[PDB]
């Protein structure tokens, strides 16, 4: 079989938090259960002088009563024994936005053009993920390069998530 156990998933070696800092445009995503960022998603990663990584994220989202809003989210990352695996505590500027603590894994990135992120929120008893999400980020809010598309596809197929992503519009609803 292709291994879909979360524990077997390869992640970015020698992940470099400082290099990852800056603006990342979410170009594609795979959604988890329940409420989630819908579109117009742009993240801003930062790393302080003590190496603590954090990020803000903007995106459009509809609230359980379908109502629409621009979310301003904030996340702070706790390092683990794996440099590419973090715990991300997050919340919104607005009190009504979802809060939580998610795995945040950098599956792959070249720091200059793309990144593939992943989070499993719930393990199946067989070790596969029961509830995941994943972002494909770009430094440039255009399309990738065929060459980069290939690499992202391979990563997506490592996560057992190939063919489960949707393209994300950007049209300044948030600005
Ligand atoms: C914080 C943040 C992230 C996740 C945001 C999430 C999970 C938003 C969910 C918002 C909801 C459900 C709002 C409605 O109440 C990602 C991974 C983009 C990276 C940058 C920082």
From Swiss-Prot:
Mark the residues carrying the PTM Omega-N-methylarginine: 121
Q: Which organism is it from?
A: Bos taurus
Q: Which GO terms describe its molecular function?
A: retinal binding; retinol binding; retinol transmembrane transporter activity
Where does it mainly reside? secreted
User: How does this protein assemble?
Assistant: Interacts with TTR. Interaction with TTR prevents its loss by filtration through the kidney glomeruli. Interacts with STRA6.
Keyword check for Disulfide bond, yes or no: yes
Q: What is this protein called?
A: Retinol-binding protein 4
Kindly give the PROSITE patterns that the UniProt entry links to this protein: LIPOCALIN
Tissue spec. comment: Detected in blood plasma (at protein level).
CDD domains xref list:
lipocalin_RBP_like (cd00743)
Q: Which GO terms describe its biological process?
A: retinol transport
Q: Name one GO cellular component term.
A: extracellular space
